[PDB]
Design a protein around this ligand. Structure first.
Ligand SMILES: *[C@@H]1O[C@H](CO)[C@@H](O)[C@H](O)[C@H]1NC(C)=O
Lengths: 38, 49
């Protein structure tokens, strides 16, 4: 995955990717990738 | 081989969308079963039931 930084915190994800990690646009603001919150 | 594939490019659009439709259907099948609750319940440390 290129163009999206990785952050260790977990939130509820909206755009699925696979293998338990999603991507979302949060806080300027940029696209981030994180493990989804169950 | 790719030049003659343009005559059947509409066929491959159907097949690629079909496998994409299968993949999203298999993905949402797990959420329709296991993801019934929005909250995760922790097991209490007391095992005296
Ligand atoms: C997230 O926090 C953990 C806590 O130890 C740390 O190990 C990890 O490096 C952190 N990740 C980032 C991207 O800062």
């Amino acid at each position: 995955l290129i163009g999206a930084e990785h952050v260790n915190n977990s939130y509820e994800c909206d755009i699925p990717i696979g293998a338990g990690i999603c991507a979302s646009y949060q806080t300027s603001q940029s696209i981030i990738a994180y493990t989804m919150s169950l | 081989c790719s030049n003659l594939l343009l005559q059947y490019g509409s066929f491959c659009t159907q097949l690629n969308r079909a496998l994409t439709g299968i993949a999203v259907e298999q993905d949402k099948n797990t959420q329709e079963v296991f993801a019934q609750v929005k909250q995760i319940y922790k097991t209490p440390p007391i095992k005296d039931f």
